[PDB]
Short mmCIF file of C-alpha atoms in Angstrom, two decimals:
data_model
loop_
_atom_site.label_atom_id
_atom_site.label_comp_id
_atom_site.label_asym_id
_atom_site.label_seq_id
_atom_site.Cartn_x
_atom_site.Cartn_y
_atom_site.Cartn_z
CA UNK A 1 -24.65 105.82 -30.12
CA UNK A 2 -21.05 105.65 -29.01
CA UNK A 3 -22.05 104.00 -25.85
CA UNK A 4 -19.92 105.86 -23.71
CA UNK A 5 -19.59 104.79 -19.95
CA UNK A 6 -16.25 104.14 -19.79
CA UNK A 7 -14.51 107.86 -20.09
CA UNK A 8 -16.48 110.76 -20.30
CA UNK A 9 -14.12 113.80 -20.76
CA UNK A 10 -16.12 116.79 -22.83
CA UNK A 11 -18.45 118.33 -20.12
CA UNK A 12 -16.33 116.67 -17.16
CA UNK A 13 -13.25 118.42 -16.88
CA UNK A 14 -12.48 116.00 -13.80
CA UNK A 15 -9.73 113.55 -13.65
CA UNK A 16 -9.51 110.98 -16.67
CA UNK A 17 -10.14 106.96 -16.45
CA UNK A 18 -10.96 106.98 -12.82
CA UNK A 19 -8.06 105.74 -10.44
CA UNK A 20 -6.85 104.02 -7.43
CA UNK A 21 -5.42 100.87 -6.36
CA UNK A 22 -5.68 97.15 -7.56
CA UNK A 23 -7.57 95.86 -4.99
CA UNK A 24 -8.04 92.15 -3.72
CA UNK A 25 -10.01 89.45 -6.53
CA UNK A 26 -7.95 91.08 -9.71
CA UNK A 27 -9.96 94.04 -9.38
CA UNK A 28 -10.01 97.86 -9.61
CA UNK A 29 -11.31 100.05 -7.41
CA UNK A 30 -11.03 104.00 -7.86
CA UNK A 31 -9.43 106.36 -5.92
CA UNK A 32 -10.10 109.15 -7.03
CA UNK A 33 -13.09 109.34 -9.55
CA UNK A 34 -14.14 110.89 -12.60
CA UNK A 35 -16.97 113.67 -11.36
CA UNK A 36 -13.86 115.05 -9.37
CA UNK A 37 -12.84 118.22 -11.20
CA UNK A 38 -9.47 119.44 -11.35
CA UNK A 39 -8.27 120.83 -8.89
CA UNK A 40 -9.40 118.06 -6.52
CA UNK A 41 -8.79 117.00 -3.29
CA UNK A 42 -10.85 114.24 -1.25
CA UNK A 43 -9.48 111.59 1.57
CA UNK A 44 -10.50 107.58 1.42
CA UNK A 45 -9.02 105.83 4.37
CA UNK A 46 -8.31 101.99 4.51
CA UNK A 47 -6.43 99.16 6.68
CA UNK A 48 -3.54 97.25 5.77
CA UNK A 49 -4.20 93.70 5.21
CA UNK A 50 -1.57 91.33 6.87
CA UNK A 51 -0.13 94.64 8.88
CA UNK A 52 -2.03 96.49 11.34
CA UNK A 53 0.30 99.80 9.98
CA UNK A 54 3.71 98.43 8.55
CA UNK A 55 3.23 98.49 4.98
CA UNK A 56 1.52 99.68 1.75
CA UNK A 57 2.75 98.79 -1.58
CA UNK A 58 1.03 102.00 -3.50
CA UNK A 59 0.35 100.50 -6.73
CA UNK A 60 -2.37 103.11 -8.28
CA UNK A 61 -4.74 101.64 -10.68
CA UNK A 62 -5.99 103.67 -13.33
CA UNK A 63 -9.01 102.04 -15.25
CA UNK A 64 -13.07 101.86 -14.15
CA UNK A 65 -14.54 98.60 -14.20
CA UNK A 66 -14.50 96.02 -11.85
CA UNK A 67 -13.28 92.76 -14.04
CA UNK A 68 -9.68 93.95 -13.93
CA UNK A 69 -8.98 95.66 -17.90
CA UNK A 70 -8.29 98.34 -15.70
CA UNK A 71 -4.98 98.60 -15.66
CA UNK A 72 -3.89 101.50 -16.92
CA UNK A 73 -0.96 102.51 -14.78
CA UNK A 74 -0.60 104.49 -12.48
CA UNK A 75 2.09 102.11 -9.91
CA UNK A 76 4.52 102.74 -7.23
CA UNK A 77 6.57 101.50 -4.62
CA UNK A 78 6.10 100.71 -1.09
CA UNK A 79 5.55 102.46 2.61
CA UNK A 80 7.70 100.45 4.98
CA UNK A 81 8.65 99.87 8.64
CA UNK A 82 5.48 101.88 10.03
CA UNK A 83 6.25 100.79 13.71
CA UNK A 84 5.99 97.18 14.04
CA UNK A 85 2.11 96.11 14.12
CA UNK A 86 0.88 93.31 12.65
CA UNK A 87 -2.65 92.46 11.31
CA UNK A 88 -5.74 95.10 11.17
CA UNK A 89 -6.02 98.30 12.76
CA UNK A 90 -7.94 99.95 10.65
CA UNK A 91 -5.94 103.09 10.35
CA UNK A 92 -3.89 104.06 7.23
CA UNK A 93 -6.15 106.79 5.60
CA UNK A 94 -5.02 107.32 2.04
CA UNK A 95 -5.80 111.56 1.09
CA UNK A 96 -6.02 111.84 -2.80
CA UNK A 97 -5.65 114.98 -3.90
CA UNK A 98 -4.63 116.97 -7.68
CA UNK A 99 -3.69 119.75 -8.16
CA UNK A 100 -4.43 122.74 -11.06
CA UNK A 101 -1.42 122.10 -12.98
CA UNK A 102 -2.72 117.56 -13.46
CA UNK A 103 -0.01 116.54 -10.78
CA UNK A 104 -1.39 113.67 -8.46
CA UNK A 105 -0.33 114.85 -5.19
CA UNK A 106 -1.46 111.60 -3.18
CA UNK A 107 0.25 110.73 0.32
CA UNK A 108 -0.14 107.39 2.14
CA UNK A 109 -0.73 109.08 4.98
CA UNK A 110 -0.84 106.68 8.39
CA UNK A 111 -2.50 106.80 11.21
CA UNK A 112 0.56 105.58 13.29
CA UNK A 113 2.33 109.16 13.74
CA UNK A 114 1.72 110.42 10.66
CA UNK A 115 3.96 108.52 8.94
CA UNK A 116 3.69 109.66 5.07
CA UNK A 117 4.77 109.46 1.78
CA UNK A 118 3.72 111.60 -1.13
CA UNK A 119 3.79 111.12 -4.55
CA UNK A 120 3.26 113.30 -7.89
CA UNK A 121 2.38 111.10 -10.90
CA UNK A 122 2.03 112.81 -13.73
CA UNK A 123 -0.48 111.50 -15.75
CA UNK A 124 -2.09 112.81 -19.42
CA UNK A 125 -3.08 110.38 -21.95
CA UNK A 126 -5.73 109.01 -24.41
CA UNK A 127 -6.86 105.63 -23.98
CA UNK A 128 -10.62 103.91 -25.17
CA UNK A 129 -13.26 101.74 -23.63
CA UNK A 130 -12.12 98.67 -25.51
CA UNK A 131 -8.49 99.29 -24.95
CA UNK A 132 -9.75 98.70 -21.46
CA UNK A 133 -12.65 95.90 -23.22
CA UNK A 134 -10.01 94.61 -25.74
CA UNK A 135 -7.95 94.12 -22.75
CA UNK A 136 -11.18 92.32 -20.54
CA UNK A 137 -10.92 89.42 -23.45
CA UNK A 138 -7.34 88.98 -24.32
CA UNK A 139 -5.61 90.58 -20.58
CA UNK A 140 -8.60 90.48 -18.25
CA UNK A 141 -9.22 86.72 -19.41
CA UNK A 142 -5.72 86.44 -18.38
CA UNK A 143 -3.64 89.41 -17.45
CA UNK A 144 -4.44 90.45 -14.46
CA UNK A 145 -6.55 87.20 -13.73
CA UNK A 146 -3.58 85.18 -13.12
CA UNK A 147 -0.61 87.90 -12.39
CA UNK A 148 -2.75 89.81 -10.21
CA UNK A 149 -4.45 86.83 -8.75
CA UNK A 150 -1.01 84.64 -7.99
CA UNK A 151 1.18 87.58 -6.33
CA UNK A 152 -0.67 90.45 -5.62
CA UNK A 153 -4.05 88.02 -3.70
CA UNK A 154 -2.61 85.10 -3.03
CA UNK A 155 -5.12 83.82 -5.02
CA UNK A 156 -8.10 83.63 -2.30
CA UNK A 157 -10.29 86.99 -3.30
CA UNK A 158 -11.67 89.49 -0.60
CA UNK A 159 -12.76 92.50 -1.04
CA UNK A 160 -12.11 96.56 -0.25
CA UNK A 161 -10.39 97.49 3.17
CA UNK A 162 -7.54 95.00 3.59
CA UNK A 163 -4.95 96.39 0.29
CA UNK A 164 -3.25 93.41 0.46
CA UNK A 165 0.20 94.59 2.30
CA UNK A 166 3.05 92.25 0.94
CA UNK A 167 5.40 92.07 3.07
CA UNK A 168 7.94 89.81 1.66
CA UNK A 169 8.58 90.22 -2.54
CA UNK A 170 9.37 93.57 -3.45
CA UNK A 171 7.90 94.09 -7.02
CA UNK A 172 11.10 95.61 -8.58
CA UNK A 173 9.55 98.39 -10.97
#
């Protein structure tokens, strides 16, 4: 009775927390999931928010629940200047892919010309359910409650689709 439901990594040999984007509300949502065995490869498509196709900050999110201790990082930068559009579209699909060697090979990939730009995170570590728990009470209470709801919402909530394109505000990694 270890309650596991968090990470399940013994007769999975898939990708390890599940991982995405922080997504609109302080949330998580997966990308790529555990279930997906290495090597992997699957597509999700989404919109940009406040830009039809101008922008995506890529800001990967690995955790699993949806009250935000799911933080485990996985960030990046931003896609910019994708022919100016403004506002819905809904046509930036986002491919996800490992590969055999546990290099993410994901590439905001847009539906504009083709517009794309790849990354290769590496990504091999240990982490717990209650280091993502531990985190709900002390950082999910207020981590990613107020950070994520005051400059990466605009504290308002939605939902999945609309990734919340900044525009202005460049989170200086």
């Amino acid at each position: 009775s270890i309650e596991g439901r968090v990470k399940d990594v013994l007769l999975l040999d898939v990708t390890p927390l599940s991982l995405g984007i922080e997504t609109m509300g302080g949330v998580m949502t997966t990308l790529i999931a555990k279930n997906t065995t290495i090597p992997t490869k699957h597509s999700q498509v989404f919109s940009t928010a406040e830009d039809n196709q101008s922008a995506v900050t890529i800001h990967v999110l690995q955790g699993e629940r949806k009250r935000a201790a799911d933080n485990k990082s996985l960030g990046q930068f931003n896609l910019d200047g994708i022919n100016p559009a403004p506002r819905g579209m809904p046509q930036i699909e986002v491919t996800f892919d490992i590969d055999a060697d546990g290099i993410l090979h994901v590439s905001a990939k847009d539906k504009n010309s083709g517009k794309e730009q790849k990354i290769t995170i590496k990504a091999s570590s240990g982490l717990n359910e209650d280091e993502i728990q531990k985190m709900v009470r002390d950082a999910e209470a207020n981590a990613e409650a107020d950070r994520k709801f005051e400059e990466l919402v605009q504290t308002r909530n939605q939902g999945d689709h609309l990734l919340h394109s900044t525009r202005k505000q460049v989170e200086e990694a």
